[PDB]
mmCIF file of all heavy atoms in Angstrom:
data_model
loop_
_atom_site.group_PDB
_atom_site.id
_atom_site.type_symbol
_atom_site.label_atom_id
_atom_site.label_comp_id
_atom_site.label_asym_id
_atom_site.label_seq_id
_atom_site.Cartn_x
_atom_site.Cartn_y
_atom_site.Cartn_z
ATOM 1 N N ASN A 50 -21.647 12.929 -17.637
ATOM 2 C CA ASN A 50 -22.326 13.427 -18.828
ATOM 3 C C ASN A 50 -21.639 12.956 -20.103
ATOM 4 O O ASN A 50 -22.308 12.591 -21.076
ATOM 5 C CB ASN A 50 -22.401 14.951 -18.791
ATOM 6 C CG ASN A 50 -23.209 15.521 -19.936
ATOM 7 O OD1 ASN A 50 -24.067 14.843 -20.501
ATOM 8 N ND2 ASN A 50 -22.937 16.770 -20.288
ATOM 9 N N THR A 51 -20.308 12.951 -20.119
ATOM 10 C CA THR A 51 -19.552 12.573 -21.305
ATOM 11 C C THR A 51 -19.256 11.080 -21.362
ATOM 12 O O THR A 51 -18.586 10.629 -22.296
ATOM 13 C CB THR A 51 -18.247 13.366 -21.375
ATOM 14 O OG1 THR A 51 -17.421 13.024 -20.255
ATOM 15 C CG2 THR A 51 -18.531 14.858 -21.347
ATOM 16 N N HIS A 52 -19.744 10.312 -20.386
ATOM 17 C CA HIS A 52 -19.543 8.869 -20.326
ATOM 18 C C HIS A 52 -18.068 8.507 -20.416
ATOM 19 O O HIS A 52 -17.697 7.535 -21.084
ATOM 20 C CB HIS A 52 -20.330 8.168 -21.435
ATOM 21 C CG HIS A 52 -21.810 8.352 -21.328
ATOM 22 N ND1 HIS A 52 -22.578 7.675 -20.406
ATOM 23 C CD2 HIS A 52 -22.662 9.140 -22.022
ATOM 24 C CE1 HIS A 52 -23.841 8.038 -20.538
ATOM 25 N NE2 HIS A 52 -23.920 8.926 -21.514
ATOM 26 N N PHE A 53 -17.220 9.285 -19.746
ATOM 27 C CA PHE A 53 -15.793 8.994 -19.657
ATOM 28 C C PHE A 53 -15.629 7.957 -18.551
ATOM 29 O O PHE A 53 -15.308 8.268 -17.405
ATOM 30 C CB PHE A 53 -14.997 10.268 -19.387
ATOM 31 C CG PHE A 53 -13.529 10.150 -19.690
ATOM 32 C CD1 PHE A 53 -12.749 11.286 -19.827
ATOM 33 C CD2 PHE A 53 -12.926 8.911 -19.836
ATOM 34 C CE1 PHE A 53 -11.401 11.187 -20.103
ATOM 35 C CE2 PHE A 53 -11.581 8.807 -20.109
ATOM 36 C CZ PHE A 53 -10.817 9.946 -20.243
ATOM 37 N N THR A 54 -15.862 6.698 -18.919
ATOM 38 C CA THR A 54 -15.907 5.592 -17.969
ATOM 39 C C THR A 54 -14.625 5.477 -17.158
ATOM 40 O O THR A 54 -14.667 5.417 -15.926
ATOM 41 C CB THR A 54 -16.177 4.276 -18.703
ATOM 42 O OG1 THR A 54 -17.495 4.300 -19.264
ATOM 43 C CG2 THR A 54 -16.058 3.098 -17.752
ATOM 44 N N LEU A 55 -13.478 5.467 -17.839
ATOM 45 C CA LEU A 55 -12.210 5.264 -17.147
ATOM 46 C C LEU A 55 -11.854 6.442 -16.248
ATOM 47 O O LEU A 55 -10.991 6.316 -15.373
ATOM 48 C CB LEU A 55 -11.098 5.011 -18.166
ATOM 49 C CG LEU A 55 -9.884 4.239 -17.655
ATOM 50 C CD1 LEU A 55 -10.332 3.045 -16.827
ATOM 51 C CD2 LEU A 55 -9.029 3.783 -18.822
ATOM 52 N N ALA A 56 -12.501 7.588 -16.444
ATOM 53 C CA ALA A 56 -12.256 8.770 -15.630
ATOM 54 C C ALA A 56 -13.228 8.904 -14.464
ATOM 55 O O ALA A 56 -13.200 9.924 -13.768
ATOM 56 C CB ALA A 56 -12.314 10.031 -16.495
ATOM 57 N N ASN A 57 -14.085 7.909 -14.235
ATOM 58 C CA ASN A 57 -15.004 7.942 -13.104
ATOM 59 C C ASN A 57 -14.299 7.785 -11.762
ATOM 60 O O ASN A 57 -14.917 8.041 -10.723
ATOM 61 C CB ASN A 57 -16.072 6.855 -13.261
ATOM 62 C CG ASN A 57 -17.212 7.281 -14.168
ATOM 63 O OD1 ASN A 57 -17.348 6.790 -15.289
ATOM 64 N ND2 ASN A 57 -18.049 8.188 -13.679
ATOM 65 N N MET A 58 -13.030 7.379 -11.756
ATOM 66 C CA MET A 58 -12.250 7.259 -10.531
ATOM 67 C C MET A 58 -11.579 8.560 -10.120
ATOM 68 O O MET A 58 -11.085 8.661 -8.992
ATOM 69 C CB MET A 58 -11.181 6.174 -10.694
ATOM 70 C CG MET A 58 -10.109 6.526 -11.708
ATOM 71 S SD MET A 58 -9.002 5.151 -12.053
ATOM 72 C CE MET A 58 -10.090 4.066 -12.970
ATOM 73 N N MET A 59 -11.552 9.552 -11.007
ATOM 74 C CA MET A 59 -10.956 10.849 -10.693
ATOM 75 C C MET A 59 -11.608 11.552 -9.506
ATOM 76 O O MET A 59 -10.871 12.031 -8.628
ATOM 77 C CB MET A 59 -10.988 11.717 -11.962
ATOM 78 C CG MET A 59 -11.371 13.177 -11.750
ATOM 79 S SD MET A 59 -10.079 14.186 -11.002
ATOM 80 C CE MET A 59 -10.919 15.761 -10.885
ATOM 81 N N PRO A 60 -12.942 11.656 -9.404
ATOM 82 C CA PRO A 60 -13.516 12.340 -8.233
ATOM 83 C C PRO A 60 -13.175 11.679 -6.909
ATOM 84 O O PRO A 60 -13.036 12.376 -5.900
ATOM 85 C CB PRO A 60 -15.025 12.310 -8.519
ATOM 86 C CG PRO A 60 -15.211 11.194 -9.456
ATOM 87 C CD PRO A 60 -13.998 11.193 -10.321
ATOM 88 N N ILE A 61 -13.024 10.355 -6.881
ATOM 89 C CA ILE A 61 -12.673 9.680 -5.634
ATOM 90 C C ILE A 61 -11.265 10.068 -5.195
ATOM 91 O O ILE A 61 -11.015 10.323 -4.011
ATOM 92 C CB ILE A 61 -12.823 8.157 -5.789
ATOM 93 C CG1 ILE A 61 -14.285 7.801 -6.055
ATOM 94 C CG2 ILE A 61 -12.313 7.440 -4.554
ATOM 95 C CD1 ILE A 61 -14.583 6.335 -5.906
ATOM 96 N N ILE A 62 -10.326 10.119 -6.141
ATOM 97 C CA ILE A 62 -8.966 10.561 -5.831
ATOM 98 C C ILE A 62 -8.976 12.007 -5.356
ATOM 99 O O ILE A 62 -8.273 12.378 -4.401
ATOM 100 C CB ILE A 62 -8.053 10.372 -7.061
ATOM 101 C CG1 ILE A 62 -7.414 8.981 -7.063
ATOM 102 C CG2 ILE A 62 -6.982 11.446 -7.114
ATOM 103 C CD1 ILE A 62 -8.384 7.843 -7.271
ATOM 104 N N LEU A 63 -9.774 12.848 -6.019
ATOM 105 C CA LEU A 63 -9.905 14.235 -5.592
ATOM 106 C C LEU A 63 -10.409 14.313 -4.159
ATOM 107 O O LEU A 63 -9.907 15.102 -3.355
ATOM 108 C CB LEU A 63 -10.842 14.987 -6.541
ATOM 109 C CG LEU A 63 -11.142 16.453 -6.222
ATOM 110 C CD1 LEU A 63 -11.135 17.268 -7.500
ATOM 111 C CD2 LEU A 63 -12.480 16.604 -5.507
ATOM 112 N N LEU A 64 -11.394 13.480 -3.819
ATOM 113 C CA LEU A 64 -11.939 13.457 -2.465
ATOM 114 C C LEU A 64 -10.891 12.999 -1.457
ATOM 115 O O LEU A 64 -10.811 13.522 -0.336
ATOM 116 C CB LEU A 64 -13.161 12.539 -2.427
ATOM 117 C CG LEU A 64 -14.184 12.736 -1.312
ATOM 118 C CD1 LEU A 64 -14.867 14.078 -1.479
ATOM 119 C CD2 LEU A 64 -15.202 11.608 -1.323
ATOM 120 N N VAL A 65 -10.091 12.002 -1.836
ATOM 121 C CA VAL A 65 -9.053 11.483 -0.945
ATOM 122 C C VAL A 65 -8.057 12.584 -0.603
ATOM 123 O O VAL A 65 -7.756 12.844 0.569
ATOM 124 C CB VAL A 65 -8.353 10.272 -1.584
ATOM 125 C CG1 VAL A 65 -7.091 9.922 -0.817
ATOM 126 C CG2 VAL A 65 -9.298 9.082 -1.629
ATOM 127 N N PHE A 66 -7.549 13.267 -1.628
ATOM 128 C CA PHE A 66 -6.589 14.332 -1.354
ATOM 129 C C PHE A 66 -7.260 15.531 -0.691
ATOM 130 O O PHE A 66 -6.612 16.265 0.066
ATOM 131 C CB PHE A 66 -5.866 14.726 -2.639
ATOM 132 C CG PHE A 66 -4.836 13.724 -3.069
ATOM 133 C CD1 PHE A 66 -5.171 12.685 -3.921
ATOM 134 C CD2 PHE A 66 -3.539 13.803 -2.594
ATOM 135 C CE1 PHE A 66 -4.227 11.757 -4.303
ATOM 136 C CE2 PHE A 66 -2.591 12.878 -2.973
ATOM 137 C CZ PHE A 66 -2.936 11.853 -3.828
ATOM 138 N N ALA A 67 -8.562 15.712 -0.921
ATOM 139 C CA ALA A 67 -9.313 16.755 -0.234
ATOM 140 C C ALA A 67 -9.321 16.534 1.268
ATOM 141 O O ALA A 67 -9.024 17.451 2.043
ATOM 142 C CB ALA A 67 -10.743 16.791 -0.768
ATOM 143 N N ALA A 68 -9.653 15.323 1.702
ATOM 144 C CA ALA A 68 -9.671 15.082 3.137
ATOM 145 C C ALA A 68 -8.263 14.961 3.707
ATOM 146 O O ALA A 68 -8.066 15.209 4.899
ATOM 147 C CB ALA A 68 -10.508 13.849 3.464
ATOM 148 N N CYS A 69 -7.268 14.627 2.878
ATOM 149 C CA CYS A 69 -5.882 14.746 3.330
ATOM 150 C C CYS A 69 -5.534 16.193 3.667
ATOM 151 O O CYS A 69 -4.945 16.474 4.720
ATOM 152 C CB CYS A 69 -4.928 14.208 2.264
ATOM 153 S SG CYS A 69 -4.774 12.412 2.229
ATOM 154 N N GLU A 70 -5.898 17.127 2.784
ATOM 155 C CA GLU A 70 -5.680 18.543 3.070
ATOM 156 C C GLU A 70 -6.488 18.987 4.285
ATOM 157 O O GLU A 70 -6.028 19.820 5.076
ATOM 158 C CB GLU A 70 -6.029 19.384 1.840
ATOM 159 C CG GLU A 70 -7.138 20.404 2.055
ATOM 160 C CD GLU A 70 -7.643 20.997 0.757
ATOM 161 O OE1 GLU A 70 -6.904 20.950 -0.248
ATOM 162 O OE2 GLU A 70 -8.783 21.505 0.742
ATOM 163 N N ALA A 71 -7.695 18.440 4.447
ATOM 164 C CA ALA A 71 -8.500 18.762 5.622
ATOM 165 C C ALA A 71 -7.815 18.307 6.905
ATOM 166 O O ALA A 71 -7.813 19.034 7.904
ATOM 167 C CB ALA A 71 -9.886 18.132 5.498
ATOM 168 N N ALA A 72 -7.239 17.103 6.901
ATOM 169 C CA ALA A 72 -6.508 16.616 8.067
ATOM 170 C C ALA A 72 -5.286 17.483 8.347
ATOM 171 O O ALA A 72 -4.969 17.778 9.507
ATOM 172 C CB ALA A 72 -6.105 15.155 7.860
ATOM 173 N N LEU A 73 -4.579 17.890 7.288
ATOM 174 C CA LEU A 73 -3.465 18.822 7.447
ATOM 175 C C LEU A 73 -3.918 20.096 8.152
ATOM 176 O O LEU A 73 -3.288 20.553 9.118
ATOM 177 C CB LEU A 73 -2.869 19.163 6.080
ATOM 178 C CG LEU A 73 -1.460 18.663 5.765
ATOM 179 C CD1 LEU A 73 -0.815 19.529 4.690
ATOM 180 C CD2 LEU A 73 -0.612 18.643 7.017
ATOM 181 N N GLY A 74 -5.011 20.681 7.673
ATOM 182 C CA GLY A 74 -5.560 21.886 8.258
ATOM 183 C C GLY A 74 -5.966 21.705 9.703
ATOM 184 O O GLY A 74 -5.719 22.581 10.532
ATOM 185 N N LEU A 75 -6.592 20.568 10.016
ATOM 186 C CA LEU A 75 -7.014 20.291 11.385
ATOM 187 C C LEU A 75 -5.817 20.188 12.324
ATOM 188 O O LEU A 75 -5.847 20.696 13.451
ATOM 189 C CB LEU A 75 -7.849 19.009 11.426
ATOM 190 C CG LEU A 75 -9.289 19.132 10.928
ATOM 191 C CD1 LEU A 75 -10.007 17.799 11.035
ATOM 192 C CD2 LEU A 75 -10.025 20.203 11.714
ATOM 193 N N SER A 76 -4.756 19.508 11.884
ATOM 194 C CA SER A 76 -3.553 19.402 12.705
ATOM 195 C C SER A 76 -2.902 20.763 12.930
ATOM 196 O O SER A 76 -2.474 21.091 14.045
ATOM 197 C CB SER A 76 -2.567 18.429 12.061
ATOM 198 O OG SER A 76 -2.969 17.092 12.295
ATOM 199 N N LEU A 77 -2.825 21.568 11.873
ATOM 200 C CA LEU A 77 -2.268 22.936 12.037
ATOM 201 C C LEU A 77 -3.162 23.714 13.008
ATOM 202 O O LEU A 77 -2.616 24.449 13.849
ATOM 203 C CB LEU A 77 -2.192 23.610 10.665
ATOM 204 C CG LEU A 77 -1.129 23.038 9.729
ATOM 205 C CD1 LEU A 77 -0.970 23.910 8.496
ATOM 206 C CD2 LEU A 77 0.200 22.895 10.451
ATOM 207 N N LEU A 78 -4.481 23.528 12.909
ATOM 208 C CA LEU A 78 -5.435 24.244 13.799
ATOM 209 C C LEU A 78 -5.133 23.891 15.258
ATOM 210 O O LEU A 78 -5.045 24.821 16.079
ATOM 211 C CB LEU A 78 -6.860 23.831 13.426
ATOM 212 C CG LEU A 78 -7.972 24.473 14.251
ATOM 213 C CD1 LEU A 78 -8.490 25.730 13.572
ATOM 214 C CD2 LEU A 78 -9.107 23.488 14.487
ATOM 215 N N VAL A 79 -4.970 22.600 15.563
ATOM 216 C CA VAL A 79 -4.753 22.183 16.981
ATOM 217 C C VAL A 79 -3.446 22.815 17.474
ATOM 218 O O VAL A 79 -3.421 23.275 18.627
ATOM 219 C CB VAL A 79 -4.758 20.651 17.168
ATOM 220 C CG1 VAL A 79 -5.954 19.999 16.494
ATOM 221 C CG2 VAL A 79 -3.465 19.988 16.726
ATOM 222 N N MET A 80 -2.418 22.855 16.625
ATOM 223 C CA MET A 80 -1.105 23.399 17.054
ATOM 224 C C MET A 80 -1.273 24.882 17.399
ATOM 225 O O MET A 80 -0.756 25.300 18.447
ATOM 226 C CB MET A 80 -0.055 23.242 15.951
ATOM 227 C CG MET A 80 0.598 21.874 15.934
ATOM 228 S SD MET A 80 1.316 21.418 17.533
ATOM 229 C CE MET A 80 0.088 20.263 18.138
ATOM 230 N N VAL A 81 -1.990 25.632 16.560
ATOM 231 C CA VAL A 81 -2.229 27.080 16.831
ATOM 232 C C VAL A 81 -2.976 27.209 18.162
ATOM 233 O O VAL A 81 -2.555 28.030 18.997
ATOM 234 C CB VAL A 81 -3.007 27.753 15.685
ATOM 235 C CG1 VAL A 81 -3.435 29.168 16.044
ATOM 236 C CG2 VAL A 81 -2.215 27.746 14.389
ATOM 237 N N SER A 82 -4.029 26.411 18.356
ATOM 238 C CA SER A 82 -4.824 26.475 19.609
ATOM 239 C C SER A 82 -3.928 26.125 20.799
ATOM 240 O O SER A 82 -4.018 26.811 21.826
ATOM 241 C CB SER A 82 -6.013 25.562 19.538
ATOM 242 O OG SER A 82 -6.765 25.624 20.741
#
């Protein structure tokens, strides 16, 4: 909306660390199981 062109890469980085946390959670889940 604000046409912050150079900041269009921020959501991709957020997604990368999001699925990193998801992988962390999945590994902790398997250990508990």
Side-chain angles (χ1 to χ4, degrees):
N50 185 24
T51 64
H52 298 284
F53 198 163
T54 294
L55 204 45
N57 278 109
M58 67 188 71
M59 139 74 182
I61 296 193
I62 271 67
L63 178 139
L64 202 66
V65 168
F66 285 91
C69 280
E70 120 192 338
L73 248 204
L75 284 181
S76 283
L77 290 190
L78 180 93
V79 311
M80 276 306 103
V81 171
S82 180

